[PDB]
Amino acid sequence: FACKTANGTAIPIGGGSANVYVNLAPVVNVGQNLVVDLSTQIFCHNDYPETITDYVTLQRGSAYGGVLSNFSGTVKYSGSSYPFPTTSETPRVVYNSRTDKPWPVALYLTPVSSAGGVAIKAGSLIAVLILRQTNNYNSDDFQFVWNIYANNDVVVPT
Ligand SMILES: OC[C@H]1O[C@H](Oc2ccc(-c3ccccc3)cc2)[C@@H](O)[C@@H](O)[C@@H]1O
Numbered sequence: 001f002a003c004k005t006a007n008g009t010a011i012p013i014g015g016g017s018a019n020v021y022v023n024l025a026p027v028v029n030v031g032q033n034l035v036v037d038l039s040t041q042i043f044c045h046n047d048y049p050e051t052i053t054d055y056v057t058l059q060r061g062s063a064y065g066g067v068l069s070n071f072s073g074t075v076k077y078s079g080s081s082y083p084f085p086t087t088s089e090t091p092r093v094v095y096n097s098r099t100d101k102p103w104p105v106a107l108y109l110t111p112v113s114s115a116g117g118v119a120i121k122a123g124s125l126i127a128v129l130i131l132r133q134t135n136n137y138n139s140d141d142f143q144f145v146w147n148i149y150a151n152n153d154v155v156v157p158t
């Protein structure tokens with residue numbers, strides 16, 4: 001089991017970490033969602049589906065910088081919504097193919113009432129998402145750590 005980003009940055013068998021730089025909607029109003037869809041950014045696969053089944057969860061999702069200070073968050077994992085920053089490990093998504101399958105993670109961030117102006121700074125860390133991978137074959141329990149950075153400023157009109 002291993003993962004890679006859209007630009008081809010890989011995290012190999014055994015886990016590790018990678019930086020993910022994402023484009024954000026430049027203008028987000030109060031009452032609207034800023035959507036950070038990682039399913040277009042992160043792809044994983046099973047290296048031995050003939051014999052092994054892989055289990056993948058969002059173990060933990062943390063908010064940083066402007067997202068932590070200026071947004072109320074929800075994370076959608078494989079069709080279900082949970083608080084973001086997270087309060088528990090999600091259910092599993094099964095990986096049973098050698099063909100790449102997106103990691104079905106999306107952040108839904110809406111501005112808090114106090115937000116206004118540059119709510120996210122370009123180049124700043126906005127989130128850390130931990131993909132936890134196990135299986136039905138051995139004792140492997142690996143973390144794939146995804147550090148999410150903003151490519152641009154995000155303004156909340158006042
Ligand atoms: O995706 C599946 C797994 O791929 C890796 O582990 C193994 C472990 C054993 C074998 C193997 C076993 C018998 C004969 C030949 C190869 C192949 C892969 C490792 O990533 C792991 O966590 C992940 O569940």
